[PDB]
Design an enzyme around this catalytic site. Structure first.
Site, PDB file in Angstrom:
ATOM      1  N   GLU A 324       0.753  -1.128   0.188  1.00  9.92           N
ATOM      2  CA  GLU A 324      -0.046  -0.293  -0.532  1.00  9.92           C
ATOM      3  C   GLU A 324       0.964   0.851   0.093  1.00  9.92           C
ATOM      4  O   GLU A 324       0.283   2.330   0.653  1.00  9.92           O
ATOM      5  CB  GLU A 324      -0.799  -0.234   1.042  1.00  9.92           C
ATOM      6  CG  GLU A 324      -2.061  -0.766   0.659  1.00  9.92           C
ATOM      7  CD  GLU A 324      -2.553  -1.020   2.074  1.00  9.92           C
ATOM      8  OE1 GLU A 324      -2.702  -1.039   3.591  1.00  9.92           O
ATOM      9  OE2 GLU A 324      -3.648  -1.939   2.018  1.00  9.92           O
TER      10      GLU A 324
HETATM   11  C1  LIG Z   1      -0.854  -6.272   4.431  1.00  7.67           C
HETATM   12  C2  LIG Z   1      -2.014  -5.823   4.387  1.00  7.67           C
HETATM   13  O1  LIG Z   1      -3.124  -5.824   4.771  1.00  7.67           O
HETATM   14  N1  LIG Z   1      -1.890  -4.156   4.915  1.00  7.67           N
HETATM   15  C3  LIG Z   1      -3.357  -2.804   5.467  1.00  7.67           C
HETATM   16  C4  LIG Z   1      -4.892  -3.300   4.965  1.00  7.67           C
HETATM   17  N2  LIG Z   1      -5.251  -2.871   3.686  1.00  7.67           N
HETATM   18  O2  LIG Z   1      -6.466  -3.769   3.883  1.00  7.67           O
HETATM   19  C5  LIG Z   1      -6.935  -3.457   2.347  1.00  7.67           C
HETATM   20  O3  LIG Z   1      -6.912  -3.152   1.401  1.00  7.67           O
HETATM   21  N3  LIG Z   1      -8.981  -2.602   2.887  1.00  7.67           N
HETATM   22  C6  LIG Z   1      -8.846  -2.411   2.161  1.00  7.67           C
HETATM   23  C7  LIG Z   1      -9.204  -2.617  -0.084  1.00  7.67           C
HETATM   24  C8  LIG Z   1     -10.203  -2.408  -0.473  1.00  7.67           C
HETATM   25  C9  LIG Z   1     -11.566  -1.279  -0.155  1.00  7.67           C
HETATM   26  C10 LIG Z   1     -11.212  -1.457   1.623  1.00  7.67           C
HETATM   27  C11 LIG Z   1     -10.052  -1.197   2.267  1.00  7.67           C
HETATM   28  O4  LIG Z   1      -5.999  -4.488   5.685  1.00  7.67           O
HETATM   29  C12 LIG Z   1      -5.429  -4.483   6.970  1.00  7.67           C
HETATM   30  C13 LIG Z   1      -6.868  -4.844   8.230  1.00  7.67           C
HETATM   31  O5  LIG Z   1      -7.020  -6.199   7.679  1.00  7.67           O
HETATM   32  C14 LIG Z   1      -4.024  -3.653   8.202  1.00  7.67           C
HETATM   33  O6  LIG Z   1      -4.815  -2.453   7.660  1.00  7.67           O
HETATM   34  C15 LIG Z   1      -3.357  -3.771   6.534  1.00  7.67           C
HETATM   35  O7  LIG Z   1      -2.115  -2.784   7.029  1.00  7.67           O
END
Ligand SMILES: CC(=O)N[C@H]1/C(=N/OC(=O)Nc2ccccc2)O[C@H](CO)[C@H](O)[C@@H]1O
Length: 504
Positions: A324
């Site tokens: 991210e």
């Molecule tokens: C590798 C990883 O997990 N990075 C982040 C996240 N990454 O989360 C998303 O990308 N969420 C998301 C994606 C699309 C729509 C709404 C939320 O998920 C986790 C929570 O479950 C934590 O925030 C992490 O820091």
């Protein structure tokens, strides 16, 4: 033939009788039983004196656990002449086909004998041994009125995957050394063998770096929601590593970069283009933060952090994150991740990174991809480069709510109940790869207390642990579900504040 999938149990969750989890390669029971009495000793014998000394430590660890619930004072003896009523731990004549973590465990009326190739396998086998004894053995206080029996039995066992891990996010909410040790200890009982610490993110920095002291003085002073935060001194981190090592658990520390770096950016103005410290963040947004990819101060900072962490972290791996980085261009990400990989390698560490870090032109075949996206294209670079892959699909995102109405957890990967946490295979996430194993990720955006951790990890982690250990051909939800019902009192005895999942 007729087949069906599982629904919720009518009338609510269900949550001489061993309860082995994960399911071992083979388990047979015969007539008779061993009785563990107050006069029992643990005998240890290795192939040489050094190995015997290592087994002796493992034996004392087992004695400690047994003594807490039985009220006995079982002690350990360096001898290959066990006496009737003894537990015998040995590496002499181990079956090499079972590998480093494999073991045979044969209980007769007079003796328990655990035969492994390596001390590590004896430790894993001891986790099975604890599950052969009656419910009550896993209490932390003395249990009366239970005969401490083990049925005559024959077990052989080895893991399917080499890497079977748990990640705890201590950046979003801080957890104490005691809390971390407890989660490591509980996980170890289910043959989890890796612990990944997410030590830094936007809302907090959790590891003392002596050369950049404001990472703690400023960067550690908050968390999600405005609580006080916290951190580990280097001594505390070494203590965690030591505690994990006694359970044959490798600790892989993560400093996430170039994204998820607001805490660093809030500590040192010089890490920002305008030279000013960022305000600390206590929300749950992701993706917005970045180190300066074309400034040398960035790489000096990273080298100082890696130098200090490498000095106190014996694992051959350091996790540099890489998820991210949405405020970092593709070109700058490629360049940045290659540069920091070179730094890590220069300090003798191989790099683990979240996808898409494998795409960096600076990766090597020794780098490891943690594949969380699990799309058709994810890890194309890793596969081409011969990089090992650790999978963390939706089914391993244990911070997901069990159900729509869960009181804690996220839901961006959908809901993950105990069944969903079981009914998958690592090859579902990625095809054509060298799959090193599985990692359950416990992010902590919404978890503040130890009870929250217990609720979300148990029973979900049990499902993931079995996916990592037990071969696909021998995994079956109907089987696991009934075994988990049987296992429930053991969770309660351990003081785990688990969720009584209505699908069980
Ligand atoms: C590798 C990883 O997990 N990075 C982040 C996240 N990454 O989360 C998303 O990308 N969420 C998301 C994606 C699309 C729509 C709404 C939320 O998920 C986790 C929570 O479950 C934590 O925030 C992490 O820091």
């Amino acid at each position: 033939h007729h087949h069906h999938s599982s629904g919720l149990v009518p009338r609510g969750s269900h949550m001489s009788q061993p309860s082995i989890l994960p399911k071992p390669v083979s388990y047979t029971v015969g007539s008779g039983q061993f009785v563990l009495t107050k006069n029992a000793s643990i005998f240890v014998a290795g192939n040489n004196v050094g190995e015997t000394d290592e087994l002796f430590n493992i034996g004392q660890a087992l004695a400690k656990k047994l003594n807490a619930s039985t009220g006995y004072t079982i002690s350990v003896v360096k001898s290959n002449q066990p006496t009737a009523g003894s537990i015998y731990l040995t590496t002499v004549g181990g079956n090499a086909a079972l590998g480093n973590e494999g073991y045979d465990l044969i209980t007769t009326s007079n003796q328990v004998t655990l035969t492994a190739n390596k001390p590590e396998g004896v430790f894993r086998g001891n986790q099975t041994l604890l599950q052969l004894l009656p419910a009550g053995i896993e209490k932390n206080t003395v249990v009366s009125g239970v005969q401490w029996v083990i049925p005559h039995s024959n077990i052989s066992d080895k893991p399917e995957y080499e890497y079977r891990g748990l990640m705890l996010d201590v950046a979003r909410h801080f957890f104490t050394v005691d809390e971390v040790k407890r989660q490591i200890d509980l996980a170890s009982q289910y043959k989890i063998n890796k612990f990944h610490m997410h030590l830094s993110d936007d809302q907090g920095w959790r590891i003392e770096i002596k050369s950049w002291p404001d990472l703690i003085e400023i960067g550690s002073k908050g968390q999600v929601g405005g609580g006080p935060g916290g951190y580990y001194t280097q001594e505390q981190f070494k203590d965690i590593v030591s505690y994990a090592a006694e359970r044959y658990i490798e600790v892989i520390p993560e400093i996430d970069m170039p994204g998820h770096t607001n805490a660093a950016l809030a500590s040192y103005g010089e890490l920002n283009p305008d030279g000013k410290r960022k305000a600390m963040r206590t929300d749950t947004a992701v993706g917005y933060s970045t180190l300066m990819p074309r400034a040398e101060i960035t790489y000096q900072f990273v080298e100082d952090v890696i130098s200090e962490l490498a000095a106190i972290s014996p694992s051959p791996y350091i996790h540099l994150g890489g998820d991210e980085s949405n405020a970092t261009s593709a070109a700058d990400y490629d360049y940045f991740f290659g540069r920091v990989t070179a730094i890590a390698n220069s300090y003798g560490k191989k790099v683990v990174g979240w996808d898409p870090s494998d795409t960096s032109s600076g990766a090597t075949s020794d780098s490891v991809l943690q594949n969380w996206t699990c799309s058709a294209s994810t890890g194309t670079a890793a596969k081409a480069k011969g990089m090992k892959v650790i999978v963390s699909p939706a089914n391993a995102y244990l911070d997901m709510k069990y159900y729509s109405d869960s009181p804690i957890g996220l839901q961006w990967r959908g809901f993950v109940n105990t069944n969903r946490a079981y009914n998958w295979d690592p090859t579902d996430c990625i095809k054509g790869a060298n799959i090193y194993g599985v990692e359950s990720t416990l992010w902590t955006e919404t978890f503040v207390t130890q009870d929250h951790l217990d609720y979300m990890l148990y029973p979900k982690l049990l499902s993931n642990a079995e996916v990592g250990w037990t071969a696909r051909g021998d995994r079956n939800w109907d089987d696991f579900k009934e075994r988990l019902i049987e296992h429930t009192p053991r969770l309660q005895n351990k003081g785990i504040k688990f969720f009584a999942d209505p699908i069980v």
